[PDB]
Amino acid sequence: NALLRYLLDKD
């Protein structure tokens, strides 16, 4: 969900 989605989009 949200946390995995964040990590893939970040940086």
Added chain:
Amino acid sequence: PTLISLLEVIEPEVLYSGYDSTLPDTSTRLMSTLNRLGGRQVVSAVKWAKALPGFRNLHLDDQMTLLQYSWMSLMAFSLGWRSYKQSNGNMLCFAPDLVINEERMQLPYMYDQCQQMLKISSEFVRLQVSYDEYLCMKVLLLLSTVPKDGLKSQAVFDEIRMTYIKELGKAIVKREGNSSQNWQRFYQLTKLLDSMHEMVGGLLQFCFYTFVNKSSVEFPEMLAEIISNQLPKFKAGSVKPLLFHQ
């Protein structure tokens, strides 16, 4: 600037658990410390995967799926590797501050799962796997478990696998120096990859059990999010393990 050298550079640094063996040794503390370490390692693995040439060509949903489906395999494979290098497969080397003795495995609450994890490292010992072989296989593990209903960007995924199967070939050559029996080496490494589903299946089983029946063990949000998402799909038999040999 080769693909294998890039895999060397993007390989995550070995993390420290911060385990405090001055405190009392209990089952709950150990599994919670290992879960916290695992959560951090998974975060690193996401960063690692994002840096793999090709991975970002995949649809975001496919990217999430592959990480959700293979995370345990990646962790256990890495643990197998560390244990092979640090102690020749005699000890479980979770972290340089959290190394489990043969004597520390003789505890009832952790004997079985430790034996399962040692089997992985003993395969590295048996095959004398090289560093580049390990790195190529690890990429392929990320690409080894898929949904039965398929994937959103199948063609890209098929080309990625193709790319890293060839890189594994280069790793075999870099180690042996062009033998005529390199096909036997390739066969042995693909057989090891295949057997990772079974060797890890029992680890996921115990993990899912501990997560559902809270038999009080703490899971960080990173692991909790993946496990609770991964859980109903395995029970539905909706996951397809990719195998090189039928």
